[PDB]
Amino acid sequence: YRYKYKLMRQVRMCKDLKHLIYYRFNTGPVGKGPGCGFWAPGWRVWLF
RNA sequence: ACUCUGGUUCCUCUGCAUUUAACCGUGAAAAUCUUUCGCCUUUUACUAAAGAUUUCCGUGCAAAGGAGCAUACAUUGAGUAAAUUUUUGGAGUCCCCUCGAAAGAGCGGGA
Ligand SMILES: [Mg+2]
Numbered sequence: 202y203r204y205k206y207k208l209m210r211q212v213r214m215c216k217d218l219k220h221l222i223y224y225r226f227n228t229g230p231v232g233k234g235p236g237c238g239f240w241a242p243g244w245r246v247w248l249f
Numbered sequence: 250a251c252u253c254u255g256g257u258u259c260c261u262c263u264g265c266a267u268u269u270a271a272c273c274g275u276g277a278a279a280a281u282c283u284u285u286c287g288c289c290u291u292u293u294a295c296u297a298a299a300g301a302u303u304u305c306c307g308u309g310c311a312a313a314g315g316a317g318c319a320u321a322c323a324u325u326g327a328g329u330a331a332a333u334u335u336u337u338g339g340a341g342u343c344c345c346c347u348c349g350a351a352a353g354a355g356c357g358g359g360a
Contacts, residue, residue, distance in 0.1 A: 206295050248306080249278045
């Protein structure tokens, strides 16, 4: 971000996808904490 | 009877994918310029909207050439195989009057 502050656009978007993914992932007995490994949405952002 | 060609899979070149309601992309970046908002003692890197252009990751089809695999001649464009009322298994023949040298023609007449 130091060398390209517009990259805050993608930083925000991966923060937004994490909330999207986690709150559907962490449902029922699956609690808070590590293990949410659905890496594909976040990966795509950085390829674009 | 004519000329027309082996299937598949892959590589690469060339051309085209504008009458967009909308869509070569059921996905989604970056830049430049112009303008308008917000940061700010400046510039860069920025905010977030508009308009105009670019680059980049990709897409489709046609056509040509080549490279691998196992193997088949047909088949495309041009063009093949019924004696019972309505058609293709005979209601057909023959003979007088008329106009005209000539040969036909009248819902002509007769067997
Ligand atoms: Mg100065």
